[PDB]
């Protein structure tokens, strides 16, 4: 399948070079997989989700996304026009309030919730969790991410936007999950992207067009935007049978575009998510 005039990020993950505008992907498109978006919520009624999204848990007064961040990330995972895995099932867990903030205790509870909840869902091709959030180092937050990964969920987390070593941020610094940095359309490390040895992979993160609340769209930037590219790619590859939840991050790194990125500090991987599609 081919989506013409795709958002640059989708085109980038199906090409060995920057500057293309078509997203090439297998028609299976993540069908039979499930992705939990742990964030500010998801506007599930947005036409772009085609009924494939639903809220399953909130830690606040409402399950509504009053911010937009979660809806944007969800859109990059699996919306029709802006998504990597266009037929995946999306589950929203609202651990962030409508200002985009959340206590570590709530974020941890949300991770433990997903580890349990997945046992009540029909996700024959596997389960992914996308965490476009983070803050200062916390061994408790790292431990929760490790548990979620251990339980059989492919965990993808944002490296953070501090232009610093991700070792001082959580859950970015948990080695057992998939830690994602951001690149721009010219294959540069995004100027805000964290780096360091704990990074596993880079994905598109600057000027990413996706769904927004009020049935709208908008373009924003961050490692929060790169993370759902990788989460969606994992769901896509699991549906194809190429990899499993335990090994998807490694498979993605193994099959990535290597050495294409500029402004990568010594000691950080130069690996850009790539779906290796061939018609
Ligand atoms: Ca290349
Ligand atoms: Ca890792």
Swiss-Prot record:
**EC number(s) per entry:** 3.4.21.64
- Residues engaged in binding Ca(2+) 1: 175, 177, 200
Q: Which GO terms describe its biological process?
A: proteolysis
Residues where Ca(2+) 2 binds:
16, 260
Protein name as catalogued: Proteinase K
| Organism from which the protein derives | Parengyodontium album
What functional role does this protein have? Answer: Hydrolyzes keratin at aromatic and hydrophobic residues.
Record gene name: PROK
Q: In what residue span(s) does the Peptidase S8 domain sit?
A: 7-279
Give me the disulphide-bonded residues: 34-123, 178-249
Reactions catalysed, semicolon-separated, are: Hydrolysis of keratin, and of other proteins with subtilisin-like specificity. Hydrolyzes peptide amides
**What Gene Ontology molecular function terms does this protein carry?**
metal ion binding; serine-type endopeptidase activity
Q: What keywords tag this UniProt record?
A: Calcium, Disulfide bond, Hydrolase, Metal-binding, Protease, Serine protease, Signal, Zymogen
**Cofactor(s) needed for function:** Ca(2+)
What Gene Ontology cellular-component terms does the record carry? extracellular region
- Family the UniProt entry places it in: Belongs to the peptidase S8 family.
**Which catalytic residues are annotated?**
39 (charge relay system), 69 (charge relay system), 224 (charge relay system)
Q: How is the cofactor bound?
A: Binds 2 calcium ions per subunit.
């Amino acid at each position: 399948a081919a989506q013409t005039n795709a958002p640059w990020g989708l085109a980038r993950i199906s090409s060995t070079s920057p500057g293309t505008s078509t997203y090439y992907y297998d028609e299976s498109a993540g069908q039979g997989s499930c992705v939990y978006v742990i964030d500010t919520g998801i506007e599930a009624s947005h036409p772009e989700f085609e009924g494939r999204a639903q809220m399953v848990k909130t830690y606040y007064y409402s399950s509504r996304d009053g911010n937009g961040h979660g809806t944007h990330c969800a859109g990059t995972v699996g919306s029709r026009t802006y998504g990597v895995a266009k037929k995946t099932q999306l589950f929203g867990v609202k651990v962030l309030d409508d200002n985009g903030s959340g206590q570590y205790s709530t974020i941890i509870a949300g991770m433990d919730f997903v580890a349990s909840d997945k046992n009540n869902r029909n996700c024959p091709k596997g389960v992914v969790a996308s965490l476009s959030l983070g803050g200062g180092y916390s061994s408790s937050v790292n431990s929760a991410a490790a548990r979620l990964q251990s339980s059989g969920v492919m965990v993808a987390v944002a490296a953070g936007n501090n232009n610093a070593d991700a070792r001082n941020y959580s859950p970015a610094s948990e080695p057992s999950v998939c830690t994602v940095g951001a690149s721009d359309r010219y294959d540069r490390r995004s100027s805000f992207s964290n780096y360091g040895s704990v990074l596993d992979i880079f994905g598109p993160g600057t000027d990413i067009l996706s769904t927004w609340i009020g049935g709208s769209t908008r373009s924003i930037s961050g490692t929060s935007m790169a993370t759902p590219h990788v989460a969606g790619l994992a769901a896509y590859l699991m549906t194809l049978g190429k990899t499993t939840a335990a090994s998807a991050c490694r498979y993605i790194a193994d099959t990535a575009n290597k050495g294409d990125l500029s402004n990568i500090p010594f000691g950080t991987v130069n690996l850009l998510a790539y779906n290796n599609y061939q018609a």
